[PDB]
Amino acid sequence: DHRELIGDYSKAFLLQTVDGKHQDLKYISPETMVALLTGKFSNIVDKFVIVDCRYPYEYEGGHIKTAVNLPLERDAESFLLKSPIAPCSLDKRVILIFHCEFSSERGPRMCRFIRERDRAVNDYPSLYYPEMYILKGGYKEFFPQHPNFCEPQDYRPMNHEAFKDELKTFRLKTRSW
Incomplete structure (x- = not known):
């Protein structure tokens, strides 16, 4: 791989990334989202959580299958880190x-x-x-x-x-404005 390692420096990123606003973050395209949903990475990816940060009404009007709605920072920390x-x-x-x-x-x-x-x-x-x-x-x-x-x-x-x-x-409902 031609990029740096993932956060715990154990191995390279699995997915192909595309350029996005934040130069330091890793972005993927709809196509790679579908490859995961279709099990293309099933032998290496045990679990993949799709976090839809949108507000509840947005999520209720249409979301990606299997995604979880975690619109507040406190909800995300609770769901992912507890x-x-x-x-x-x-x-x-x-x-x-x-x-x-x-x-x-x-x-x-x-x-x-x-x-x-x-x-x-x-x-x-x-x-x-x-x-x-x-x-x-x-x-x-x-x-x-x-x-x-x-x-x-x-x-x-x-x-x-x-x-x-x-x-x-x-x-x-947000912690800060």
Whole structure:
């Protein structure tokens, strides 16, 4: 591989990455998301968690199959770090994929937050989640390309006319503005 090692310096990144806003983060395309969903990496990837950081109404109006909705930092830490999601075999990998509507600001931030917490509870350079990626373009670019991998087969933008109130209600739940 021509890149650096994953977070615990144990091995190279598995997935092919594409260029994204944050030069230091690893992004993947809809295509690689589908290869994982289709089991193309089944002999090496034990588990892969898709974290959809969007607000609940967004997730309810259409999300990627198997994805988990973890819109708040506290929910993500609770879900991923209280009892780490570990592979059934040590020859195997666990991978996290973060995304939001277009995975621009919120996705990167949650990803950076989980890495910090992970660095915090482990002895360097050990990690529970050494390999993390962001889905370039988020759901918004994923849906039109592979609608049958989404449930419900639909899309609800964050700024949807009819949920202005839910967006407001929801922002008031975040730890900081």
